[PDB]
Amino acid sequence: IHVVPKLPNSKALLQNGVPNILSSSGFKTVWFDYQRYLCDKLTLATAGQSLESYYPFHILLKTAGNPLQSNIFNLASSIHNNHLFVENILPSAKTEPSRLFLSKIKDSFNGSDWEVVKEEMIYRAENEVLGQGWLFLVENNEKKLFILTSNNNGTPYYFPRNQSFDLNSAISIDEFATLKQMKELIGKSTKLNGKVQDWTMPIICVNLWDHAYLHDYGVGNRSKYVKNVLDNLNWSVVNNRIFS
């Protein structure tokens, strides 16, 4: 039985929700209703199996390579990502960005400062993520940050399941080349499961699903919601997520 995690200051979040991003009704939709929905669906899908004993992150890491249980993976991914998202918008466990994170953004993004990087992430979310999706700021094994976007329920950890390219429409030839090299990397591995190593981790997570913003911000104006999320993050969690 997967159960919705308890959140600090739950009474205040019920009363008002996350300040300056969501109202109480919106926070109910994004977390109290959607997280319960996802957890119940995962429990129904994985009950009576081994996967009931593993956490959603270990579930999605286990299930990433098997086509026929993608649904479980999707649920697991959401159940993880949503919580990550919530944790970077919780009022508290004003928090300030750390020196190390600022240095990494400055070094990772070709000298660009953090705020223009925020605007660039807003642009990326507006452009590529058509409809439901997730936005992440992630660090790779080279100690380099970069911006990743996943369509529907995708994971930053495993690059085969990043779901960063929307094939329903066309794809740029460069995106096709990226897909082909990715598939070659997958195929090179000698493991029977076909697994590959990916040490990417999410430092920032933003929920672009309609549950997050539609009730508070409408069909349009999603970039407004993303800007509000990024401006008022809980920087203690974000700083802790980085390793030194």
Binding site: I1, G48, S70, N71, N151, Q163, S164, L167, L179
Partner: protein, 66 residues
């Protein structure tokens, strides 16, 4: 509560069908064993069809999104 087949913390299996059959007979919603067994069987078929469709559609979506 066995008014419905799906239980949280339980898989969806044939034993759920037998449990729903016994619940139906106990409440006397149906009289004969065969009738309740058939009704639970049809609920089982509906639920399993829904799960099969979720799996197929999920795999198709995954391939759709790269």
């Amino acid at each position: 509560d066995w008014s419905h087949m799906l239980q949280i913390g339980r898989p969806l299996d044939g034993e759920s069908v037998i449990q729903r059959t016994m619940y139906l007979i106990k409440t006397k919603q149906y009289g004969d064993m065969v009738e309740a067994y058939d009704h639970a069987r049809y609920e089982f078929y509906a639920l399993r069809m829904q799960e099969e469709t979720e799996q197929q559609v999920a795999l198709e979506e995954a391939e759709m999104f790269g």
